[PDB]
Amino acid sequence: PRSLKKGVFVDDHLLEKVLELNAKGEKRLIKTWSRRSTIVPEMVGHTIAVYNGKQHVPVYITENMVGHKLGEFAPTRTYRGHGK
Amino acid sequence: ARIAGVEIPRNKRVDVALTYIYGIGKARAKEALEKTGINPATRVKDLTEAEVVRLREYVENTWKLEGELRAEVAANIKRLMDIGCYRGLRHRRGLPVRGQRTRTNARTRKGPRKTVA
Amino acid sequence: GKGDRRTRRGKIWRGTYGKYRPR
Amino acid sequence: MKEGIHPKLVPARIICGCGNVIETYSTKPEIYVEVCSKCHPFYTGQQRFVDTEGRVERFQRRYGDSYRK
Amino acid sequence: TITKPVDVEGKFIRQTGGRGQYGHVKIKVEPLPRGSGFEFVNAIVGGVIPKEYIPAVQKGIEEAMQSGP
Amino acid sequence: PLDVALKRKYYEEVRPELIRRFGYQNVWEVPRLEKVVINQGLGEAKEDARILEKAAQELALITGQKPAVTRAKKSISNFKLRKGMPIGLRVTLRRDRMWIFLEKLLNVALPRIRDFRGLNPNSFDGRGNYNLGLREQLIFPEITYDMVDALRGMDIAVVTTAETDEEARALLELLGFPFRK
RNA sequence: GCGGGGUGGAGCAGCCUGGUAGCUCGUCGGGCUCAUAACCCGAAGGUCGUCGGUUCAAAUCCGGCCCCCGCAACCA
RNA sequence: GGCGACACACGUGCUACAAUGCCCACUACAAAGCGAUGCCACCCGGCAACGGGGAGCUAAUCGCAAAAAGGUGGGCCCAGUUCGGAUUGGGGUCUGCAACCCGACCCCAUGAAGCCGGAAUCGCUAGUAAUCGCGGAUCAGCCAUGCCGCGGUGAAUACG
RNA sequence: CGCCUCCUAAAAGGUAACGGAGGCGCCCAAAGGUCCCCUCAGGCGGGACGGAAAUCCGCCGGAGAGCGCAAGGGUAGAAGG
Ligand SMILES: [Mg+2]
Ligand SMILES: [Mg+2]
Ligand SMILES: [Mg+2]
Ligand SMILES: [Mg+2]
Ligand SMILES: [Mg+2]
Ligand SMILES: [Mg+2]
Ligand SMILES: [Mg+2]
Ligand SMILES: [Mg+2]
Ligand SMILES: [Mg+2]
Ligand SMILES: [Mg+2]
Ligand SMILES: [Mg+2]
Ligand SMILES: [Mg+2]
Ligand SMILES: [Mg+2]
Ligand SMILES: [Mg+2]
Ligand SMILES: [Mg+2]
Ligand SMILES: [Mg+2]
Ligand SMILES: [Mg+2]
Ligand SMILES: [Mg+2]
Ligand SMILES: [Mg+2]
Ligand SMILES: [Mg+2]
Ligand SMILES: [Mg+2]
Ligand SMILES: [Mg+2]
Ligand SMILES: [Mg+2]
Ligand SMILES: [Mg+2]
Ligand SMILES: [Mg+2]
Ligand SMILES: [Mg+2]
Ligand SMILES: [Mg+2]
Ligand SMILES: [Mg+2]
Ligand SMILES: [Mg+2]
Ligand SMILES: [Mg+2]
Ligand SMILES: [Mg+2]
Ligand SMILES: [Mg+2]
Ligand SMILES: [Mg+2]
Ligand SMILES: [Mg+2]
Ligand SMILES: [Mg+2]
Ligand SMILES: [Mg+2]
Ligand SMILES: [Mg+2]
Ligand SMILES: [Mg+2]
Ligand SMILES: [Mg+2]
Ligand SMILES: [Mg+2]
Ligand SMILES: [Mg+2]
Ligand SMILES: [Mg+2]
Ligand SMILES: [Mg+2]
Ligand SMILES: [Zn+2]
């Protein structure tokens, strides 16, 4: 994990999008590409669309998933199984 | 089942006998013999119930072990599974979590080899 | 144990220091 | 009961570790014990021993409010 | 012409002394909207079957089409 | 009989609480314990090492009561089972012996259970009685590590003159049965 | 009508004598070879034609039902 | 985002299965190379990874730097172990916009297979094989157990 | 092809056919005498391993169990254990 010296990381072009809905009118569909962003407590209860290289994965956010990034919730390898 | 939930081997030294318990590596066996004041070189068979209760009381009250440990462990894995994140998706299936390569190897997370015709 | 990071020996091999190999 | 097939029961004393003393009966007039009902962490109110862990997972994590607006 | 898409195998392997003969091809075949024509997709990945053995693996699917079942 | 701690507790502390909660117009309407049956469900002595009266001294030190044998009713193929096969032990505890044993089982043994989160508050008969299943046997004070050879659990039948589980909960409760929920 | 039969992909044991499925080929993985056969190491595949009964237990004993071989079908 | 996929098969290796060993402390003996938004003494904080300091050096000058095996003594006593370190939980440290994919390191807990390998098969004839550490290219960091080098200890056998 | 059970068999008995269906050619030294005691199958609920079904506890359950083997009759107020 990252170094605690620097603040935890959020793209700021997204945290801007998280808070601006908190005041105007929650909520619509935030199409994101920043898989790198740690989930901020201000996101909870939102639906954000993590891209996987091809498509926008709907990700509804809850209070047990915070430290984890938006990337953990939209895999890229599509698998199914082997030998079926 | 003396200390903690599991009775420890006599004849062997206590800085390893105490490691014969889930949750207690050599270093927790390092620190639990200065803090309760007992010689590491003495055997479980060469103690006194004074030396027994001090240790048992200390060891059980400090960190969490045994079932509760495993419980929280599974709990942490169950959460990682629940959401569910990739980290926890690799527990569902049962492949490596810490991003290994799978093409070859990984036989520890995958078990005995299912040779295919 | 050259793979045992919890030894002087397993730490030498990887070329790192720690509690288990102090400098 | 039936003669000479039963383990006689005598005034026994079971001592626990936490200093607790039970006076019941047994086949062994004196017995020592790990944990019991005066010390066991289910039996003792709410002693969580070490773990009021608890639901620190999650966002107690904070550390901190260090992102600009 | 057919009335349900199938997926089938064709194993022409005769190995008993140098003499040779190895020809292996698994395919999907489906019924087109009538009047269509003969459609042939080289969906071979890489060189799993070499490039040179594909002209004459159409000429074998194509040839045997001259007589239905 | 003789003075034993849980027995005195029944008469002079538990009873009257009960009479409060449920109001009985007769002193016999008020829940008693009838008996406590221990059964080593067993079957580890089928075609294997048939004679385990090492189990029957286990039981006999716990209760001070030699148990009795149980034999296979119908013979059964899949259980490797020949009718009249010894497949277990049963000891029936009543009165002082019952009190003495139940006493030691609440005061020491049930806590000596690893990972104990409390007895199941759902194993009630629907008709007043309660049943617990113990998974091994070092649980009991008079049983050491240096006596064992195998881990045998056992089934505990707790039998009561209660008519409902409501009054069965209460009664066992008041005597100190630790229920998880 | 009388007899025998039906079990891994093929061919054959086990059935009589209830318990536990075996042999040779073939298949598959690995080996040797430039390669292929041969050969060497290793492995998987029946759930015993079906339905019913006996039994604690049925490929096995008993009944019916589908199928296949052999013999009979004469004085007329 | 992928080249890091995983039902599987092959090649090349590393680390092991232990007592000629493994762990902890005490103490020795190399070479070749590298180093100015680079090497980093020593002092201090932290069990540590590292961080805040801060001296020297365009370096037969100061430094990376301890070489390691080995030597002295002490502990474990043949066990899936004080052998083994894979896997997993939690916490961290640094590089870098950013470590979910997908980094390396630290420490805490976990402590799997593996008891010397079927058919088959490689290397080496002397400072070689075996074994032990060191450096360098690349390089922000690093998935290097790879590669190209360097020295320590140091064999066996060749009738034919 | 002899023997046992059922049906045909027309409510005593008996009653045929190359009529419909089974079974016997044994067994048990206790599976015999007697005394004493005990009551089943099945259903629901509860109980470590333990499953539909091993053993344990509860409640319901007149007999559907059991009675070595076919079937019938009989049978717990026992012929059952
Ligand atoms: Mg441990
Ligand atoms: Mg990796
Ligand atoms: Mg080595
Ligand atoms: Mg080790
Ligand atoms: Mg804020
Ligand atoms: Mg030819
Ligand atoms: Mg209930
Ligand atoms: Mg009752
Ligand atoms: Mg005929
Ligand atoms: Mg056949
Ligand atoms: Mg025969
Ligand atoms: Mg036979
Ligand atoms: Mg082969
Ligand atoms: Mg050529
Ligand atoms: Mg060949
Ligand atoms: Mg049957
Ligand atoms: Mg038949
Ligand atoms: Mg003829
Ligand atoms: Mg004639
Ligand atoms: Mg990529
Ligand atoms: Mg690649
Ligand atoms: Mg082990
Ligand atoms: Mg093993
Ligand atoms: Mg170990
Ligand atoms: Mg971790
Ligand atoms: Mg990464
Ligand atoms: Mg050995
Ligand atoms: Mg070796
Ligand atoms: Mg030469
Ligand atoms: Mg190197
Ligand atoms: Mg390698
Ligand atoms: Mg008549
Ligand atoms: Mg008449
Ligand atoms: Mg007459
Ligand atoms: Mg007749
Ligand atoms: Mg009889
Ligand atoms: Mg009789
Ligand atoms: Mg008699
Ligand atoms: Mg019943
Ligand atoms: Mg039940
Ligand atoms: Mg068992
Ligand atoms: Mg009957
Ligand atoms: Mg019969
Ligand atoms: Zn106590």
Task: Report on this structure.
The structure is cut from a larger assembly and holds chains A (84 residues), B (117 residues), C (23 residues), D (69 residues), E (69 residues) and F (181 residues). Chain A has one helix and three strands. Chain A has one helix at 15-23; strands spanning 30-32, 47-51, 56-60. A three-stranded mixed beta sheet of chain A has the order 1-2-3, with no helix packed on it. Chain B is mainly α and 117 residues long. Chain B folds into two domains: 1-71, Helicase, Ruva Protein, domain 3, CATH 1.10.8; 72-117, Ribosomal protein S13/S18, C-terminal domain (30s ribosomal protein s13, domain 2), CATH 4.10.910.10. In chain B, 44% of the residues lie in helices and 0% in strands. With 23 residues, chain C is mainly alpha-helical. In chain F, strands 2-3-1-5-4 form a five-stranded antiparallel beta sheet. In chain F, helix 1 packs across helix 4 (165-175). Chain F is globular, with a radius of gyration of 18 Å. Bound molecules: magnesium ion (MG) (43 copies) and zinc ion. One magnesium ion binds next to loops of chain F. The structure holds three RNA strands. The PDB classes it as ribosome. Keywords: Ribosome, Elongation. Crystal structure of the Thermus thermophilus 70S ribosome in complex with elongation factor G in the post-translocational state (without fusitic acid). Chain A: 30S ribosomal protein S19. The organism of A is Thermus thermophilus.
Primary descriptors:
part of a larger assembly; 6 chains; A: 84 residues; alpha+beta; 30s Ribosomal Protein S19, Chain A; 3-stranded mixed sheet; 1 helix; globular; D: 69 residues; mainly beta; two-stranded antiparallel sheet; 17% strand; rod-shaped; binds magnesium ion; binds zinc ion; RNA-binding
The helix-and-strand class of chain D reads mainly beta
> Can you tell me the CATH superfamily of chain F?
Ribosomal protein L5
SSE succession of chain F? HEHEEHEEH
Give the terminus-to-terminus CA distance of chain F.
35 Å
- Which molecules are bound besides the chains? magnesium ion, zinc ion
The chain-level structural class of chain F is alpha+beta
The count of strands of chain D amounts to: 5
Rg of chain D over CA atoms, rounded to whole Å, is 24 Å
CATH class of chain F: Alpha Beta
Helix content of chain D: under 10%
Strand content of chain D: 15-25%
Strand content of chain F: 15-25%
Family (chain F): Belongs to the universal ribosomal protein uL5 family.
GO biological process, one term (chain F): translation
GO molecular function, one term (chain F): structural constituent of ribosome
Keywords (chain F): Ribonucleoprotein, Ribosomal protein, RNA-binding, rRNA-binding, tRNA-binding
